[PDB]
Each structure stands twice: as structure tokens, then as C-alpha cells.
Design a protein around this ligand. Structure first.
Ligand SMILES: Nc1ncnc2c1ncn2[C@@H]1O[C@H](COP(=O)(O)OP(=O)(O)O)[C@@H](O)[C@H]1O
Ligand SMILES: Nc1ncnc2c1ncn2[C@@H]1O[C@H](COP(=O)(O)OP(=O)(O)O)[C@@H](O)[C@H]1O
Ligand SMILES: [Mg+2]
Ligand SMILES: [Mg+2]
Lengths: 424, 424, 141
């Protein structure tokens, strides 16, 4: 029980000796030495039940307060923990083995938690406060962080940290999980090798990035690939790959390199494929240019729950760009540039699927027309509560990209896969 | 009559001795001690008929007016008082037991009332004055304060304090009022425990927020719930509830956080149920996506008169978002997302009943088909003027969610409830 | 206007408003125009349904040719039918002719309705008999 009182006393003593206002003075190593010496001198002057190990641990806690993330360090250190949910300063839950449990972890007060949240979301040049209480970001280590501030969250700052697994899935894994039928897997292989301008839509956590990463495995090793990203997610194996990453604006709101700038410059690097990590704003426009003016095979994911919604949001982003283009101009551009719209999506039981493999056939009137090569048919739910369904081909044996497939000598495999799926 | 004169004289003497302008010198506690000493001294220096009891009363009144929330402190202290409505400095009303009544409470003048309002709204850091005459805020204790300043309010500052009604109706209370037959109550228990996505329709004041709060008593405690609201009304007793709340735009349109933004963010908080306070705008779309993408158990109340009109309203809201989805796409979304629509309604005689427990069976052609488990057949009118009706099960033995009910082991309870309903 | 209707349709029954129009149908059209001016992205049918659900009565006053003012209608928003709002006038001022001084001559007559749309609302407050008597007396002509 003396741990809390000892910590408070040591914090007061450290502030008296080395105050937080002296930041950048007595830096990381200097602080690690000075605070340790001060804690030793205090343990000598001020009697405490803390032993030598306890004194070293108090020095460690001071180090955390000066350098670390507070009581989250024990949790983030562990690897079996998949999610950390803070729900205010006095209730920290953790997901272990797929089940949520309450931990005996407690922040000092909502101010400590609200400062730690700002510290965590500052790693990517982002700030969350009463000016903008909602903040979603992804850390370098490969985890997602969501924060809501006290103005909205009544109970206090709410922090959600999902630590996603490192190793990714291959198309073989997707076939194993029944995510896509093997015939669909062969058609996807043809599409990836055939150099089709495909857009991978989907919902949050639906599998967009994983699907893109599995599709890039079909890229011919001789091609010059350029991958524009925000978090260095993709893991390509080709030898001739150029990896780019946008730079978030600094604290002064200057020096930013938006994804739009990266894509615009990628047109100068003479790449054979541009792979946008995710389309969010005006860069959509530029990406289509790349898809249209010779860089066939360019891929890029976006957030949407169906091909129609994905196309609508592409139009919305292009309009946000402010180029003053009419609606039908944008629709003609989309129809000319995009070939396939693979639709990832999560099902009502939480399991992922590839629900559609669409195809922008053409533009009629003012509405774009598409035909699904595959569709997910849900039949019901099994005794375990999991959604049951099957991937059915619509029978189309002449996709609009047939010429591309033939030019590379893959039309035979495409026809074989489509007719084998049609046999069912 | 001498009480007012003595109080005024003692206040002047205290200001002469202990100046309220001396802030940071003789502060709250020192101010109270000095006020007590000064009142004791002036009792003899300023001959007042007030005895020891009246002397202490005046001491406390000085301590309040100097520091506290003026004459409001008694009203805020009581627990039966639900609302406090001050129209100027002379017409303080209060709501007790559902009845608004005037009270013999007055303020010195409008300046005192405005200062009190400024002190009250300063707890949450907001300020109200002739510069920004309107202030709506939520105090830390759950009460809501609304203040309007003299420039707009002709009669003087207007204050409205709505305390948090901390007692709600349970399901058994709704049964006692003959609002839902006990068989219907147990069917609702099965539906809530079985985590079926449900929309709670109803008209104005028909009592659908209360029904939602009763339904949220069946949520399994181990589930992470996230409730979005415009004004905090639900009181969930589970230990894992996360409470959010929209922020309306200020007078200049900045700092707005719509329910749509909250519901979109909640998809990234890893919830297991999203419980939207009330669906009015485009957020319906997001909510349905939450229902579709694995967050089974999500709820939400909307304003409609019949389940068919509720579905039409959902379609209209989803179209209002401007996502460019055709009608049949939205209808398929609604069919796949919603499972049970519960219809509350307030009848002619001022009574409130639950008139439908509908299930969205599926699509026939271009119109969504529904089947009612329960219906309130209104026969006629009591001679007293009341309306007379009976709850009856439509005879549907196995509801659409029978498999879902069985997966949780509640098939026995559902069968018993529907047999008892059918056995009458 | 939008907010006002929202107030009328969220428990604040009894609210009142005034606008500038010559006929109740013109008043409804101008309400739709204002709500569209709000810029909330609501289609016409949504606004018409909102007007139907919120408003109950529309009292149309007017100033006549001879400068005289007379309440010319007491209309009721009966409900939507297709894409047009239906209305029924409880009272109307029928202009029969002119006086010898150039004045306008007319009479207030009820359209004979006995059960207006707000019959239940009136009954809930113990006024159904007053309304019935008033309408019957008006219909006695
Ligand atoms: N078909 C699938 N089967 C199983 N898990 C999947 C599948 N697709 C994606 N995932 C899981 O989703 C997580 C990554 O989702 P991701 O698509 O990268 O996020 P986003 O779609 O938001 O970019 C990984 O942890 C991975 O295990
Ligand atoms: N079945 C019922 N019988 C009697 N009174 C009820 C019933 N349900 C709710 N009430 C009361 O009526 C009020 C309804 O308000 P509320 O539930 O907020 O309706 P809404 O949210 O639709 O406006 C509540 O204050 C509650 O005390
Ligand atoms: Mg991604
Ligand atoms: Mg309500």
C-alpha cells in the first residue's frame, strides 16, 4: 500500500530537484542519471519501506514519467494482449486469447490519461484535445490507436489500442479460410498478373490492405513498382520496388508531403505500377491519371461497403480536389481507368469475406454499369452461429479484361477457372 | 422585515472588513472563517434582534452569496426537484413530481442572477455574457445548464437546470402498467439476450427511450457497449459501458461533432454493441453498417408511427446521406441489418402501449416483408373514457431468430413464452 | 421554419407561427421553400411529410379589396396523397357581392365538417363537446 505514497513523494521530490519545465535540459541519459541519483539521495534522506530493488523500481517509474507512457508500459510490453481499452482513468480492459477481461490497472486521474493519450498520438504528428476530441491514427510499431476526449466521452478520455499481428496472410491462407474460393483465387491471380487497374474497396478491418498485399504477390518481378503509403504496411517481395511514405505536417503546420504530392511525383519516376496504400482525398484524381496514362496495373484501396459506394466516393474525392470537372467527365474517367473492383467486407459473425469481384463494363447515361464475376451468396448460419455461404460465379466467360489476359498468355487459365466455377 | 435590513448592513460591514475583491487573499476557507468571525463581531457591533440561530443563518447566507450559488443552493440540494427554471430574478419555478410550480425564491436583482449564472457555467470552462449570450453545457454531476443573457432575454437572465433523472422504469414496471403482456416481456428478454439488432420505433413521447433503456438490461455484462447520445439519458448498469455525446456547433458554427461522426468512430473502438440514442440523420447508414459488420446487438430509436413507416424513414435517412445507392440496395441493407422492430405508441387516452414486435423477414419484389410476433388489438373504449385492448401473439411459432435464440440456449424460454401467449 | 416544425413534432405541441402568404397552399409552398433554403438536403416529399406531421391548423387572414380584414380560412393539413398535401377548410368567408359604398359583402360559413382531424386532441382536454356544438351551430346555416 506504501507504493502509491512513495511514488507521490518521489514525484514531488523529483519535481523539486528536476522539474518538468526543464525539458530538453538533462536529456534522456542525463535524466536517467540525475533522477536515479536524486531517488537514491531521497531514499537515504527520507526513510521508506522500499528496498534496493524497490528504490530501483521507483527510479524506473520516474523514468517512465519522464520518458515512458505510464501504466501502459507493462501492457504494451506483453504480446499475448491483443487489445487495450481504457474507458476512462479507472477501468483498463485487455483482450487476451480473444476474450476481454478487466485488469488491475489504474491511472492517477483523467489528467494523466489525457496527457498520455496526447503523447501517444503525437508520435505521428497528431494531437487530440478539446479542439478536436476525436483522433484515429496508426503507430509505427504496427498498431492502431483511437482516442476520444472528455468533451465527448463523459467518463473521461477513452483510448483503444489494437496491436495487430505482424505476419500477414497469403492467397493460400485466404483460400484456406474460405474467404475466396479456389476458382476465385485463380481469377485473382490472373487479374494480378494481367495488369488490371483494380480498386480494393471494403469496410474497416475488412481486409483491404491484406488483400492488396496478396494481390501484389502476382506482380512480375521485372516491373518497377512504386508504393505510396502512410504507414509502411505493404510487404512486397519483388526486387525492383520503390517504397514511399508521406510526411505528416510538423507541429507548426508546415512541411507536409501529402499523398497527392507523392502520386503526382510518381508519374515522373517512370514506374510501371503505382500502388497507392489508401485513397482518402484528392489524390484519387491523380491515381486515375496513372491508371489511364500508361501505368496499367496500378492498385489502390479505399473505404467503402460496395462497388457502387466505392465509385461514389471516388467521385466525391475527385470533386473535393477542386478541379472543376463535371460529373459525367469524372464518370468517364473512372470507367476508362478502373477495371476491377474487388470488395472486401466483414460478415455479421465477424469473419471476413471477398463478397464481390466486380467489373466496370462501361458508362450508360449518367450511371456506371458493372457486372460481377463472383458474388457471395449467404444461405444461413450453422449450429455454431457462423455465417454460411458460397462464392458463385455469374457465368460470365468473357470479362472486359479478356484482351489483357490473352496478351500475356493467361486467357487459357482464366477460361478454365471461370468454366470450372461455372460447373457448380 | 428587520431580517433583510440586518443582512444588508452585515453584508456592507463584511465588504468593508473582508472585501470580496480580495480574491487570492482570504480565499474560500479563509473567507468562510473571516465571514463567521465578522458576523459574530457585528452581531454586537451592529445590534440585530437575530439570536444565535439567526446569526448563524446570516453567517451561512454571507458565506453563500460571497462564494456559493446564491439562493439556488437549497433547490439544487433537494432530490425530488427535477428541474429549476428561473425566468429573470423574480420568477424561479421548479418541477416536482412532474408538476411545474412557482416558488417564493427571488434574487437580489438581475446582476446577481447573471453573476450566479456565470459562476455556474464556469465549472465546465464556458462563459456566458453579452458577448456570447447563449450557453448550453453539461455539469460534471449529469445536470444540464442552459443560460440566456439579457441582450436576448428581455426579462433578464434565463436559467434552466435539468438534473439527471436517476430512476428509470424497469421491465416489470412496464408490465404493471399493462403496456406489455408478461409473455411479451419474456419475448423481449429473449430478443435482448439473443443480441438481435433492433430498432425501437414510436411517436413523440410514446416512451421509446425508456423501452430502449429497459432492453439494455439484458445485455450480457461481458460485452463492450458503446452508447452515442445527444443528451445523456440512458443509464446502463453493465460494467463495460462507454458513453459518448455529440457536441452542437457554437454560435459561429465551429466545433460540431454530429452523431454521424460518433457512430463512424465507434466502428473503430472495437465495440460489441452500438446503442445510438436516437437516429435522425444520415447516421442511420453508419448504424446499419455497424449491424451488418459483426456488431450484433446494436440498437437505436427512431421517430415513426408504424414499422413500415419506420423502414421508409430509415431508407429516407440513408438516401439523405448522398452515398448514391439505389433504392433496392438500401432495402437489401435494411433487410440484412435489422432483425426486430419494436413499436411503442401513445394512444388517444394518454396511455402508452407496445403495439408491435415486428420481424423483417426479407424482400418480396421491391418491398420489404414483415411478420408481427405480437400485436395490440384495440377493441373499443372503457366507459370511463380509457381505451381497451389486448396483446395477442399472431401464432407464429418459430420466429426468424429461432436459430439465433437456440444458439444461446434460450429456445426453451422462447417456446414457453410463445406457447403461453398462444395458450390464451 | 425547419426548427419550428421540429419543435411542433417533438412534444412541444401547441407551438404557433406566422408567415407571409396569401393562401394556405401558398403558405405550405413557402414553408417548403424556407426549409429548402435551410440546405439540409431534404427532398420535397420528406419536407411535405414533415409539414403534414407537424402542422395541424392553418388560419388564413387577409385584407380585402375595400381595406377590410377578415379571417378567410381555417384550414387543416389532412395528409399527404401522392406528392400533394391535402387540406380541408373548417370555415371559409364566401364573398357574395359588393355593398352600395364599394364595400365587400361576405359570410363566414362552416364546410359542414363534424369531426376535424384534431378531434382526438380536442377530446383529450375535455373540449370535444364545445367543438361539436360550435361546428353544429355553424352548420345550422
Ligand atoms: N481473409 C481474412 N481472413 C482472416 N483474417 C483476415 C482476412 N483479411 C484480413 N484479416 C485480418 O485483418 C487484419 C488486417 O486488416 P486490414 O485489412 O489490414 O485493415 P484495413 O482493411 O482497415 O486496412 C489482420 O490482422 C488480418 O489477420
Ligand atoms: N409504458 C409507460 N407507461 C407510463 N409512462 C411511461 C411509459 N413509458 C415511459 N413512460 C414515461 O413517459 C416518459 C416518456 O419519455 P421518453 O421515454 O423519453 O419518450 P421519448 O424518448 O420517445 O420522448 C418518461 O418520462 C416515462 O417516465
Ligand atoms: Mg489499411
Ligand atoms: Mg427519446
Amino acid at each position: 500500500d506504501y507504493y502509491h505514497a512513495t511514488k507521490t513523494t518521489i514525484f514531488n521530490a523529483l519535481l523539486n530537484t528536476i522539474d518538468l519545465s526543464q525539458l530538453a535540459q538533462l536529456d534522456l541519459k542525463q535524466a536517467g542519471e540525475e533522477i536515479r541519483d536524486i531517488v537514491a539521495e531521497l531514499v537515504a534522506i527520507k526513510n521508506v519501506s522500499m528496498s534496493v530493488a524497490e528504490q530501483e523500481h521507483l527510479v524506473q517509474d520516474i523514468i517512465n514519467d519522464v520518458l515512458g507512457y505510464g501504466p501502459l508500459e507493462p501492457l504494451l510490453a506483453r504480446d499475448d494482449i491483443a487489445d487495450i481499452m481504457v474507458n476512462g482513468a479507472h477501468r483498463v480492459f485487455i483482450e487476451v486469447g480473444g476474450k476481454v477481461q478487466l485488469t488491475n490497472v489504474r491511472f492517477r486521474d483523467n489528467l494523466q490519461l489525457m496527457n498520455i493519450c496526447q503523447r501517444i498520438v503525437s508520435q505521428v504528428g497528431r494531437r487530440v484535445d478539446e479542439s478536436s476530441p476525436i483522433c484515429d491514427a496508426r503507430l509505427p510499431d504496427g498498431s492502431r490507436v483511437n482516442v476520444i476526449a472528455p468533451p465527448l466521452a463523459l467518463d473521461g478520455p477513452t483510448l483503444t489500442i489494437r496491436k495487430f499481428k505482424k505476419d500477414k496472410l497469403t492467397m493460400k491462407n485466404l483460400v484456406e479460410f474460405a474467404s475466396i474460393s479456389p476458382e476465385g483465387a485463380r481469377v485473382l491471380g490472373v487479374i494480378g498478373a494481367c495488369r488490371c487497374n483494380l480498386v480494393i474497396s471494403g469496410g474497416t478491418g475488412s481486409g483491404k490492405t491484406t488483400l492488396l498485399n496478396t494481390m501484389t504477390a502476382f506482380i512480375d518481378p521485372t516491373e518497377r513498382v512504386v508504393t505510396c503509403e502512410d504507414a509502411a504496411e505493404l510487404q512486397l517481395q519483388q526486387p525492383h520496388v520503390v517504397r514511399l511514405e508521406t510526411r505528416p505536417p510538423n507541429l507548426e503546420g508546415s512541411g507536409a508531403v501529402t499523398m497527392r504530392d507523392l502520386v503526382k511525383n510518381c508519374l515522373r519516376m517512370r514506374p510501371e505500377r503505382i500502388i497507392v496504400g489508401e485513397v482518402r482525398g484528392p489524390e484519387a484524381f491523380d491515381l486515375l491519371q496513372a491508371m489511364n496514362t500508361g501505368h496499367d496495373g496500378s492498385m489502390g484501396t479505399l473505404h467503402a461497403n460496395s462497388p457502387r459506394e466505392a465509385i461514389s466516393r471516388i467521385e466525391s474525392m475527385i470533386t473535393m480536389g477542386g478541379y472543376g470537372l463535371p460529373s459525367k467527365t469524372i464518370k468517364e474517367m473512372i470507367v476508362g481507368s478502373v477495371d476491377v473492383i474487388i470488395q472486401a467486407a466483414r460478415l455479421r459473425d465477424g469473419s471476413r469475406r471477398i463478397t464481390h469481384i466486380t467489373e466496370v463494363v462501361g458508362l450508360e447515361g449518367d450511371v456506371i454499369v458493372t457486372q460481377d464475376l463472383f458474388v457471395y451468396e449467404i444461405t444461413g448460419e450453422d449450429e455454431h452461429g457462423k455465417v454460411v455461404g458460397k462464392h458463385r460465379s455469374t457465368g460470365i466467360a468473357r470479362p472486359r479484361f479478356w484482351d489483357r489476359a490473352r496478351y500475356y498468355g493467361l486467357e487459357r487459365e482464366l477460361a478454365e477457372a471461370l468454366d470450372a466455377a461455372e460447373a457448380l
